[PDB]
Write a protein that holds these residues in place. Structure first.
Motif, PDB file in Angstrom:
ATOM      1  N   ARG A 143       8.733   1.061   9.608  1.00  0.00           N
ATOM      2  CA  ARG A 143       9.240   0.053  10.544  1.00  0.00           C
ATOM      3  C   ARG A 143      10.209  -1.017  10.124  1.00  0.00           C
ATOM      4  NH1 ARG A 143       5.080  -1.880  14.654  1.00  0.00           N
ATOM      5  NH2 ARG A 143       4.576  -3.282  13.198  1.00  0.00           N
ATOM      6  N   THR A 144       9.634  -2.233   9.909  1.00  0.00           N
ATOM      7  CA  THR A 144      10.794  -3.144   8.927  1.00  0.00           C
ATOM      8  C   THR A 144      10.515  -2.860   7.362  1.00  0.00           C
ATOM      9  OG1 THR A 144       9.640  -4.690  10.555  1.00  0.00           O
ATOM     10  CG2 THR A 144      11.207  -5.703   8.884  1.00  0.00           C
TER      11      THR A 144
ATOM     12  N   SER B 161       0.873  -1.249  -0.039  1.00  0.00           N
ATOM     13  CA  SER B 161       0.051   0.065  -0.016  1.00  0.00           C
ATOM     14  C   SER B 161       0.630   1.456   0.030  1.00  0.00           C
ATOM     15  CB  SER B 161      -0.983   0.077   1.204  1.00  0.00           C
ATOM     16  OG  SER B 161      -2.032  -1.080   0.839  1.00  0.00           O
TER      17      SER B 161
ATOM     18  N   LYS C 293       8.027 -12.190   3.772  1.00  0.00           N
ATOM     19  CA  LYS C 293       6.714 -11.192   3.908  1.00  0.00           C
ATOM     20  C   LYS C 293       6.591 -11.033   2.234  1.00  0.00           C
ATOM     21  CE  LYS C 293       8.278  -7.974   7.531  1.00  0.00           C
ATOM     22  NZ  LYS C 293       8.156  -6.770   7.855  1.00  0.00           N
TER      23      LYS C 293
END
Ligand SMILES: Cc1cc2nc3c(=O)[nH]c(=O)nc-3n(C[C@H](O)[C@H](O)[C@H](O)COP(=O)(O)OP(=O)(O)OC[C@H]3O[C@@H](n4cnc5c(N)ncnc54)[C@H](O)[C@@H]3O)c2cc1C
Ligand SMILES: CC(=O)c1ccc[n+]([C@@H]2O[C@H](COP(=O)([O-])OP(=O)([O-])OC[C@H]3O[C@@H](n4cnc5c(N)ncnc54)[C@H](OP(=O)([O-])[O-])[C@@H]3O)[C@@H](O)[C@H]2O)c1
Ligand SMILES: [Cl-]
Length: 531
Positions: A206-207, A186, A325
């Protein structure tokens, strides 16, 4: 304006629900759809943020169930934009007179199985009560937006958006101090659009996620007209694959090759763009050493994309295997950070303490903003189901039964909850495949199953507890042979606080899973009990 009784009730009007409607009608069944949204499209209705785009080729990410659609629709770009995909969905919807089977603006609140009569009673926030023999939850995988976990959110003085709930009227960031929190797909897509308008853009990462160039391009109209000559054939090739596309299944091990052949090979994927690099080598999601050589090459491509070495370093994903991921396709995202007005805020080094009236405070200092965009993702896979008081035999809550992770047979049903089917959800291939392939198969498998029940004069279908336990254990077992369960992602529920960390998807590949479903139905539904 919904019927009091129906053979099948369907929740959701995105790809899954629309197709279920269309096929159930063809099969001579009464069928109706409830949809919270104003209109059809599902993710493509809700995700209207600037830059929203498919990362499966338009030629693969499309319905194949209709020859006429295949021949008549004309895609334009390697990867379709959300407006374009929404026009396609309208085109199909229109073509088969689907809206007549749908109630909009209506959210299903609760559903309870009635053992006396073998049916679901299904309530909605408008007090509708529908009785149905079968309930199909076509209610999505990535459909309930998740806010990030920190306070002061309702105290922000400016305008607040989530990409998954984007305004129907274009939003103007001109001249603004804008924050984006989240750098998954996104936020990667949305940010470079907002960078064009904002006085200052702050990207709160963040990550870091791995992203590779999309290299979008116009689609050649001749290529298209060629493709159409054998479209049915081309699609059947896509179904006979693990990922539901023409992705090359690289046969070698990422360990068997020199550093030199490895670089030359990945360089070719990198210049080509798109996700196929995920299968350059057979073992990339299976062997940590293999994975790492591929991850290293990607990280170095990343460093080289950004001029400032320190900003560049903060963009490099660390601490989890490549592809574990979801892989992201980027378009001018890394390049964006070369701009004067784009600021990468590293919240791993300085985590967010709270949202304030002015903007965002980290442990290191405060950021003033006129707008804040949350690209913070979705309570994935179970989030939409868990929003519904769903009740099975002995009055078991679905939410409680699954409170340690989703439990299902083929991802299609759960023991204790007869006549209930989940489209493209946990326990099946789901988003690990081109979702239109995963969606068409699940729709055809459930609807055939329903038609078979009617033909043979039965009215009860229940996954057999022992097979369910066996299936869940098989899912975990084959996941555990890959690097997937090792990483916090929405696949393992890591993004919702308190949510059980359990890999939710079937990793054995669309093809195998469809073969396993096909032998199940071919034996009159082994693992179900039918009465
Ligand atoms: C921004 C975005 C981009 C994506 N890009 C791709 C991609 O490139 N390739 C790919 O393969 N997949 C991608 N997808 C995955 C997408 O989930 C599937 O491809 C496909 O759109 C899912 O269709 P669906 O009909 O199952 O679910 P959805 O499209 O999510 O439809 C579900 C609908 O159900 C409704 N609903 C939920 N609960 C209720 C209820 N309680 N009562 C009434 N209605 C309810 C929702 O409002 C929603 O409209 C992406 C997803 C997101 C979020
Ligand atoms: C096809 C296509 O191109 C397209 C386009 C869009 C979506 N999709 C599909 O939908 C899925 C979801 O993608 P998405 O981007 O909406 O959601 P995400 O992937 O869940 O990333 C959430 C992000 O927000 C950050 N974050 C979360 N919580 C936070 C917190 N509490 N504090 C601070 N930050 C917080 C989180 O940080 P971290 O460290 O990784 O948790 C991450 O940066 C995709 O995978 C595709 O299936 C496809
Ligand atoms: Cl996706």
């Amino acid at each position: 304006q919904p019927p009091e009784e129906v053979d099948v009730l369907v929740v959701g009007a995105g790809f899954s629900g629309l197709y279920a409607l269309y096929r159930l009608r063809e099969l001579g069944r009464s069928v109706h759809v409830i949809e919270t949204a104003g209109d059809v499209g599902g993710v493509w209705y809700w995700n209207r943020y600037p830059g929203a785009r498919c990362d499966i080729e338009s030629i693969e990410y499309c319905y194949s169930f209709s020859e006429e659609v295949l021949q008549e629709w004309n895609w334009t770009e390697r990867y379709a934009s959300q407006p374009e995909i929404l026009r396609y969905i309208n085109f199909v919807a229109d073509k088969f007179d689907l809206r007549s089977g749908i109630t909009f603006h209506t959210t299903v609140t609760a559903a309870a199985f009635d053992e006396a009569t073998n049916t679901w009673t299904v309530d909605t926030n408008h007090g509708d009560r529908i009785r149905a023999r079968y309930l199909i939850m076509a209610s999505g995988q990535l459909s309930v937006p998740q806010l990030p976990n920190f306070p002061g959110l309702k105290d922000f003085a400016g305008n607040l958006y989530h990409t998954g709930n984007w305004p129907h009227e274009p939003v103007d960031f001109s001249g603004q101090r804008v924050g984006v929190i989240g750098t998954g797909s996104s936020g990667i897509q949305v940010s470079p659009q907002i960078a064009k308008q904002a006085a200052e853009l702050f990207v709160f990462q963040r990550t870091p996620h791995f992203a590779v160039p999309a290299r979008n391009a116009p689609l050649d109209p001749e290529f298209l007209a060629d493709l159409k000559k054998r479209y049915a054939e081309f699609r059947e090739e896509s179904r006979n694959t693990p990922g539901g596309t023409h992705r090359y299944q690289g046969p070698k091990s990422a360990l068997e090759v020199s550093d030199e052949e490895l670089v030359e090979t990945l360089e070719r994927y990198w210049q080509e763009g798109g996700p196929d690099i995920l299968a350059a080598y057979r073992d990339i999601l299976r062997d940590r050493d293999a994975n790492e050589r591929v991850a290293e090459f990607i990280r170095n491509k990343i460093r080289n994309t950004v001029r400032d070495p320190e900003v560049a370093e903060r963009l490099v994903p660390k601490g989890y295997p490549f592809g574990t991921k979801r892989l992201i396709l980027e378009i001018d995202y890394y390049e964006m950070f070369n701009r004067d007005n784009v600021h990468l805020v590293d919240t791993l080094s300085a985590p967010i303490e709270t949202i304030t009236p002015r903007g965002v405070r980290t442990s290191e200092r405060e950021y003033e903003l006129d707008s804040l965009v949350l690209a913070t993702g979705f309570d994935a896979l179970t989030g939409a189901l868990f929003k519904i008081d769903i009740r099975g035999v002995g009055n078991v809550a679905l939410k409680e039964k699954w409170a340690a992770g989703p439990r299902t047979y083929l991802g299609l049903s759960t023991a204790g909850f007869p006549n209930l089917f989940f489209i493209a959800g946990p326990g099946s291939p789901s988003a690990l495949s081109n979702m239109l392939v995963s969606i068409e198969q699940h729709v055809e498998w459930v609807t055939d199953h329903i038609a078979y029940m009617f033909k043979n004069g039965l009215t009860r279908s229940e996954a057999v507890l022992e097979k369910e336990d066996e299936w869940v254990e098989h899912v975990n077992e084959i996941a555990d042979e890959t690097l997937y369960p090792m990483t916090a992602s929405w696949y393992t529920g890591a993004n919702v606080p308190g949510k059980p960390r359990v890999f939710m998807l079937y990793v054995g590949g669309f093809h195998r899973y469809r073969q396993i479903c096909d032998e199940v139905a071919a034996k009159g539904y082994e693992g179900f009990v039918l009465t």
